[PDB]
């Protein structure tokens, strides 16, 4: 037996906010910024350049057609909250 799917890594560097996904690189990976899917965005790392507390904030879902565990991720500032 092996260990499953880990959890998100939110790194922030002034202008930008990086988003290391819990999954693998897979290429077939889908990124979803709250219902609305992300246009051909595919690596485990998402760089939300010049982040806005209204525009770039929200619910995030990284999923492959494998780990459809559909593991959310909240944002703005306090990640994984109400």
């Amino acid at each position, epitope marked *: 037996d092996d260990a499953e799917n880990i959890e998100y890594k939110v790194s922030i560097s002034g202008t930008s906010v990086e988003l290391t996904c819990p999954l693998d*690189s897979d290429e077939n990976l889908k990124w979803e910024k709250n219902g609305q899917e992300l246009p051909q965005k595919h690596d485990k790392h998402l760089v939300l350049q010049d982040f806005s507390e209204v525009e770039d904030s929200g619910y995030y879902v990284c999923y492959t057609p494998a780990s459809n565990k559909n593991t959310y991720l909240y944002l703005k500032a306090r990640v994984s909250e109400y």
Partner: antibody
Amino acid sequence: EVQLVESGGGLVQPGKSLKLSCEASGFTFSGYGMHWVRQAPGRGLESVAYITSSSINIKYADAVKGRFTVSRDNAKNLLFLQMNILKSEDTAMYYCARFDWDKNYWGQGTMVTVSS
Amino acid sequence: DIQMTQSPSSLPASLGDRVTINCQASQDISNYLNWYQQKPGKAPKLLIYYTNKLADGVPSRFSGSGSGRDSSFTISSLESEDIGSYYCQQYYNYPWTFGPGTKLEIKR
């Protein structure tokens, strides 16, 4: 264009061993999660194992969980299935596959038969 | 680990008629359901992905329907080449649980 080739199946006696080896062609295999699927005659279709692009997460179907072990070589674009302690349940045809969201890549498959 | 119910497991039908196949899972699959056309010895072709969504170069007539814990599939008007096994499969969790296997029998 996106050709896949399952290699080395055939007969085996019970509780033995077998290494199945798919070959990728026409894609960035290196960074694509892969599946191993079987069609157990009569009994129908079954998913066997899944291994991520970087081999970080491996997922097995309950029936084989244990005795079977998927692996990959991203240089020679090879997907291997390491079946051991074989049963008559494990008597099926095996295909290796790339499962996209809209696409589906299956190989020709190799027929594995387990009888004493 | 989910489970699929296909009804019927033999559908003898005349040509060019509303052929309907039904799929049913244990718990919710949330539309992550596929349909396939396995003809003769070799590999199953994908027809419909995410239930509603029709795949690339699949005849207009084929219609993937049903949601939640259930689903269906419908060849609008069964043509000559559509003869062979049909499978539903789910993609909500690994292992992908596969359907039994409906076989299309051409009524002559």
